């Protein structure tokens, strides 16, 4: 079919790249703005998340879809910074275009970026810091403020700081051959409206959204040794031989409930609704029935309370029974009204302890953004506790590393130093884009910040304390502030994997030479 | 695209707000709609207008969910609050697309505007005791003036005020008033009602069963209240619930906010003149977008002038001078477009009416400013 | 935004002149509606015949036309700098940087550049090179920096001896005009000490013309000589011929042609006469022989008749021309080009006229600096250290102008086939740890010292180059809109 | 069909002249049907060469003639002010306000502005002949006119005005100011440092026959003027021309001025008798020649009257810009005023902007001499911020419908400080609070506080925003501002008065 080769394809690759790059430019930084997407189904979705946009984004260019899969891999590896990482592919491929039109060979561009990022780890070793960082009184709050970038939660992040920290405090467990980590992605988030952001409650346990059929049951259980059972089977009314089968099936249901009553389970979790036959057995046995449960939420209950889901009741023989090993354990069961509904609160579980988060917002479009923003912050603390090395935030990292690459280019020399200079100018778009979203001047703070880092490497003792060297930048007032007063920092694993995952991503665009379009059937 | 995409979003809410300008007050006008199917809907309520119309502008679709939130609280007179969200968008034309003002700077100015607005709301605060049945009677009759059930409300609104106080009481005073069960009986006279205190199905007085074509009568003595309504026509029961069941918001708002504000669009008159005075003390970059909010506040009372057939330029000259000099209790007569103050006008509205109006307006206005552009064709 | 669209159309102007930089440069062929073939390296003739679309293209033409007064040569290495300053300034114009900071920062960079150029220019005088040396040894490669590579050795021993007769403080460009003689050789051109012009018309006594004069006298007369009516018209012309003989003029220059009566009268007396004399040739004789032009025979007097040492009739290219020698006042030496190719005559015509500009500025001040594009490298090296502390954002602005001067060594490597990166690494150490004067050497194809290479260039070329590129680049930034009626 | 249509053309031209004014201002290129390229920042010259197909917006085009005749400067300020008044009035039109109160609002505020100009005036200092006073007037023009070099151009004009100065110290009551007394010549090539001033006037012509000086003659004399039968006319003219040219040489007249067609026989005798002649003098050169020299252009071809003749103390025909040129150069002692200033530049378009800048400098002296005085006003946009506080106060003093017109009249003043920020690329919102920081809440008890004393000068001080205008000598012309608000109000109300376009037989 259509076959077109030459340098026009690489010029078209960056043209389609810069076209979709404008999507994440306005959403970068705490002051970034959201954008509305039309789903053509009558509704719309307003999101600044690059992972959600690139998924729905329609790209008619074959190479433009590579950036879509790049954000998907960064969600499992990192889980945050979607618009603060992928955005570099705009100018990085644009500066390489000037080298393609010149006599620079693509391998020099490829090997130039590899030697730059390989030796960049030693440059990062200067800005690293331990997990203790300052004198304390703020520990996981400083890393919780990392999610302020690219998101609008920075205004309400004051009260939400202690909510995220305390949610991951009691979920501690032992895994990874004895390593102590927090099993994230297991936190339940409930959507609610009313009051304000400061009224958000943190539940140190499991929260279930359902409706209790009979209010006369022991809704609130006082004391320990609470047994909870889980059954995937549906016990209800279901299909003169028709009346005889109805009586035989009713006896089978009452027999299976009798096995649960004999086990002493205080809470019975069912997938579907409960008929009137099972409700009469629960009141006499002082058991609270639960209906309309989601299978995905029941999987976390099996790990938390310790109640394994029962697919079917059977054994090696033809006897049906419910074993006692499928019962869960917790400290107490408390039921309170949460947002025009009564939810079950399971706290103090035996096997594993979980946590639930209740959020408040304006509308459903606001809660969708507030949920994913705080959900991505859970991975920020998780990835930070894995590697104690941390780097300061504020965009001062990209401006500082580009100065060391200037003398590093003179060390290597030859033709590989020109690609290093172009790679240093490519990283300068990150601090300049933040100035555009902050309605400030671009080169104003960039030229000044690089002046403090220019003499940073020239200081022999570090003369007295730090006259020039410092970290952090103030986007609101457009001034250079210290990282201690600003209180902003970012994890190292997020910054290293940023350019590391983008390494093979940008080169893949450069490796494209001949473009061929086959006509569809 | 970019700033050009926001211009289409401002005109989207501006075109919708201009339709509901005449939907406020007892003089409110009506609007006729023509669908591609050929059906016509003529009504003065903007609730069914936004639901039936399918707009091609993605920004106007967000106002449909906002109307559901405003109608969940009161629903009568709160539909025109969307105009305030549309006037702010049109107010940014000399700033956003001309001075290149950053949206967050405007949003930050709206945060100080929403905070200063609540202070002005507390300035017009006029508490009143809820123990007086005559004072609460004229309060629920405020929204009745837009209907012909005014003289019918004598035997109607008295049943609603007595039933809410039974299910309200205290706890704060927060309680659930949804336990009430209202039964509607078609046919008969509207003057015929049923006074029943108890649960409809110790030392009970009497037990009897009446004769009704719908169902029988049963009394349950407790140690909860129901309402049996007999309509004066067949389909009149739809309008009866709007003047009684939907009127329960007045009884809920007086318990949460006993204070009273000028009714009939007379509240924001003292707010606009006070907001301009609070702007002179700011003395900053944000002063211009902050002071320009008062220009959007005076557009709401112009709807009454457009309904009264007056000149909004010349009439508001003397009207704004009364609120900024004489007192903040002055108001505007919506019927004839007169300077008669709210003191002799006899109608007062709770503060929460304007609180939830401004709160939902600022929260909806900033979200529209946070949208850079709109794209289509994703094929989800 | 409107300036960017105007720059891209002006980029192709010097990109067509891109290979033309350096002595290895190429030429541009131009064919007009008259089918006149013009092949020359100089962009002044190129931009004059180049079709312009946007008015910004005329800006480079006005600077190129004024370049003859400021410098006159090296136009390939000057005009290209006007487009390079606006090429790297595109990312700055797209950002919040205004074009005023680029224009204001440019004058601050030129003020520091000219200060260093005057520092690089050193005048020893004293016992070092003097006349006939600086104009030969140091001007060997300085006179022609582009063309005449094979014939350079011929003109150093010829053209230098012609410009030696030109004394300082005079610098007359009216007497340096050349002529076009078909046929012959370039190195065989004869030196002419007096006025020489073409006959342009053939005579029946062309072979009978007098060979030489011992004491010739040139007289300029505008009287038209052309023939009862027959006796009257013949007598009036005869009386005018007798009045001319009273002055004793052996050479009579007539503006309008003469008939047979005036020719036969002058042939019998062995009196020379030449018709169809142009007005430009008459002013050349006034500044050489010192005669005068008489309109009629009323005011003609014997003292208006000038004289010269001797006259000679030269025959070259199968055609004879008038040759004057030993004029009373001659400030230059007339040169006559030769060769059979018309393009070659016009090729060296632009080059020799550009070489006299060096002699003009050398007599005022004698100065030489390192040539071969090494001047901008030392200036760009100094601007990198100063601009860091100068007025905030001006660091990145001057560094853009510092990197804009890097186009000169990149162009010299494009023609020679070298590497653009390899020369920058060698010069960076040569202009920092290697002090200054180390340049680039094309002959040995490596980096060497221009002091021992004998190749130098006047620093006055680079001084006016920045001034010529000042208002040229500032006008592009100062114009944000262009309107064309109809 | 008119308002919205005109504003579309107004916002176009208003944005065009917005970047013209100011030291950071920009120029434009205009190409006519003949291909002539002109680069200038002047709005009057701009709209003159441009072809506009919208008759409604042409009101602002013809309104420039009122400003050029009265003053000739501040043309960019009038187009920005008049264009902004119609832009801010668009909001009042959408509100339903009739043009009655809009026209009355601008006319009521116009009289209030004239009352403030007399109260806010400073820096009398009243000195005509000081060389520093000539520098204080010519320096501020770098905003509207060419800002390229104010050091050299200010010195040449100050020496030229002082050279043509009538003197007559104390009270001389000097009428008949000479606008033509200043002339510049465009010379291609060279830099501005090569430019100088000559005590006499110069012009571009070339000598032919003599080129000799002849000014060493110690009060020389100059005159000014307004088949045998075939030789009867030939010999008849040779005898008459010889006798007429001999009597002129007998009187000792070295140079003559011939304003008519000169034949070949006339130039023949001029070379023998050594008499210089001028070739085809133009209309404006003929008037300047007879007034300065004081000789009568006698049309008679014979001997002129020796009693009345021209005189030039010192004149040289040698090279000036590299070519021999005969000029009128003279000395103030024995002959009258109207000297010249020679300019040197590589670009001919830059010499045109300097010519228009110097021509506007002549009006600065006209504004001082013709009325009682030109006074002074705060420059660099510092005058408009002083009026904003005054006009805002008048809105509360006069309650009524004019408050809507007074409000938009004060907001329209924001374009002047925005001009400095827009042309410099800086954010106007950052400089805006620095402009209000001068007056703060109210004015301090001291006289001439930082509001009146200082001003807005942005070079490295953009962070501070305020700078002293006294040391910088940045001021605005009072006669220009009085005429600016008059033309802007007359042009704004004219557009609002337009009803329908009428075409008659076309």
Short mmCIF file of C-alpha atoms in Angstrom, two decimals, chain C residues 1 16 35 66 122 136 153 156 159 183 187 238-239 257 280 301 321 352 387 408 419 430 438 450 471 475 482 486:
data_model
loop_
_atom_site.label_atom_id
_atom_site.label_comp_id
_atom_site.label_asym_id
_atom_site.label_seq_id
_atom_site.Cartn_x
_atom_site.Cartn_y
_atom_site.Cartn_z
CA UNK C 1 4.63 34.80 15.43
CA UNK C 16 21.89 29.34 -1.08
CA UNK C 35 19.81 35.94 -21.22
CA UNK C 66 25.98 49.64 1.60
CA UNK C 122 47.67 45.65 17.28
CA UNK C 136 52.30 41.93 -0.49
CA UNK C 153 50.40 34.17 -7.45
CA UNK C 156 50.52 39.54 -6.09
CA UNK C 159 48.13 44.09 -8.98
CA UNK C 183 41.34 37.38 -25.72
CA UNK C 187 49.15 37.35 -16.18
CA UNK C 238 36.37 74.30 -42.95
CA UNK C 239 36.67 77.50 -40.92
CA UNK C 257 31.23 61.63 -34.70
CA UNK C 280 32.68 59.48 -18.30
CA UNK C 301 41.97 79.54 -26.16
CA UNK C 321 42.82 51.23 -28.65
CA UNK C 352 39.92 43.51 -8.06
CA UNK C 387 27.59 37.08 30.14
CA UNK C 408 31.68 30.29 10.45
CA UNK C 419 33.93 17.65 10.65
CA UNK C 430 43.35 26.63 21.08
CA UNK C 438 45.99 29.81 16.71
CA UNK C 450 47.84 31.84 11.46
CA UNK C 471 20.27 47.46 11.92
CA UNK C 475 14.78 45.76 11.75
CA UNK C 482 3.88 43.33 7.15
CA UNK C 486 -3.33 44.46 -3.56
#
